[PDB]
Design a protein around this ligand. Sequence first.
Ligand SMILES: Nc1ncnc2c1ncn2[C@@H]1O[C@H](CSCC[C@H](N)C(=O)O)[C@@H](O)[C@H]1O
Ligand SMILES: Nc1ncnc2c1ncn2[C@@H]1O[C@H](CSCC[C@H](N)C(=O)O)[C@@H](O)[C@H]1O
Lengths: 235, 239
Amino acid sequence: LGSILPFNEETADRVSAYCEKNSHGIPDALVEHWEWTRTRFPDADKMSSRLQGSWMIFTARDRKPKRILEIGCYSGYSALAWYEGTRDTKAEIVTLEYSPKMIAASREAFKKYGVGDRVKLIEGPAENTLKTLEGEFDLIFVDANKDGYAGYVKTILDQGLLSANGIILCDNVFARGLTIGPDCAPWLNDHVRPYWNGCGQALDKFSAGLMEDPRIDVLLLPVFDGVTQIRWKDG
Amino acid sequence: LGSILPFNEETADRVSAYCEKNSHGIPDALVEHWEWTRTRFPDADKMSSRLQGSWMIFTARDRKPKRILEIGCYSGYSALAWYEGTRDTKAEIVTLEYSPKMIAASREAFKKYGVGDRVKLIEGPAENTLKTLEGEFDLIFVDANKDGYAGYVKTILDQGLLSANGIILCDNVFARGLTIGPDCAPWLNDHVRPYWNGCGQALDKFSAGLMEDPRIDVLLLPVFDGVTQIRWKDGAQRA
Ligand SMILES: Nc1ncnc2c1ncn2[C@@H]1O[C@H](CSCC[C@H](N)C(=O)O)[C@@H](O)[C@H]1O
Ligand SMILES: Nc1ncnc2c1ncn2[C@@H]1O[C@H](CSCC[C@H](N)C(=O)O)[C@@H](O)[C@H]1O
């Protein structure tokens, strides 16, 4: 017996709606931004869900990080969630993105919502820009190109960008299930199958690699699209 | 469309095994206790999985709670997970249990494991013993009678048994899916369906009640059999 409840599509969606209804809601402005994003961009399925937004805000309010690093900004949704979750502490948020279209999208949203005082967006290939950062981050959200995750984590660990009591959260580790195998998401539309299959293989390599690193404790949690939590091994 | 990936039974089990393979495992001794529990008891399905064990240990090492409270000990598996996760700080672990059979099992288990004085099993109906507890806990794991969760959380908040920065984790809140609706777990064994439907009705009332409590932030996490995370609202924290 396993640790994951089996649901069909309709029922998964019902249970997700139930979780939303019975969890703290995200702000109206964030809902608005989520819908705006889905209206403007054909690849908006890359953006985190509403429930995931609730999770980001809860996690930031709970952990109270002093500085947050995000890799993969897209339209700025998850950055706005980190911002909401850190209103009390006024945490610095750094987010990395390489697409001009999405840079423009994000700066537009940040101006509209009034979050530029704490959110810093750095434009460029994250594999390069990540290395240029200094100091440390208490919470790091890795959510960019899947085939880059290993490199990102390597940089983060090698340069000490993760604070002693910090956590790394890696998103979409399951690649809709295809990380486990090409046969693990029959419901997925064939049109996006190549992409996600590509991500799956990469994310499998990544996952296996984490288990070979004596510096860290690793937990792959079967929630959302798969979330890997990484921390420094004690002490 | 939402946040949860749909899996059929076989595939869900493969994905669980994948998560285990790709997460740090529980200590050998704890595996031995888990296996022993499954051999000893016919109702061992009440026990958490191995992956959940890794999650408990990770969570404890991460949050570094000073004291941990647990409601529902069963055979001691989750208590020993918390124990493993707090070896460096020697956190006090209080665990509440009412079944004579499981109390005997757990005390023997704790002695075999060689836990110190820091693991404390309190016998009796948790609804009454929980009120007798003093001080505060940084992590509280609710895993007892599903129809009691609301009452437990109420006591916990009313008496300030949760620390300012503490968290409550409530397990099995989905009741296999039946908390959401009686048609949400067609795979479920019919023999345990009435039981879990009862649990689901109680847990649905529980979940709705949390949303009305102005003291707390709530996140119902669609992981395992449903895990409700509860914290004080920033403004509701007290000195
Ligand atoms: N090498 C790279 N460097 C920087 N950004 C990258 C990259 N590869 C991909 N990206 C960006 O990573 C993003 C992934 S989607 C991010 C979603 C966002 N975090 C949310 O939750 O909504 C895309 O915007 C993409 O352009
Ligand atoms: N009212 C009550 N007071 C105290 N314990 C109770 C109770 N109702 C049920 N229980 C106990 O709660 C336990 C739930 S199963 C707990 C499993 C354990 N936490 C693990 O993860 O392995 C059972 O052992 C049951 O006997």
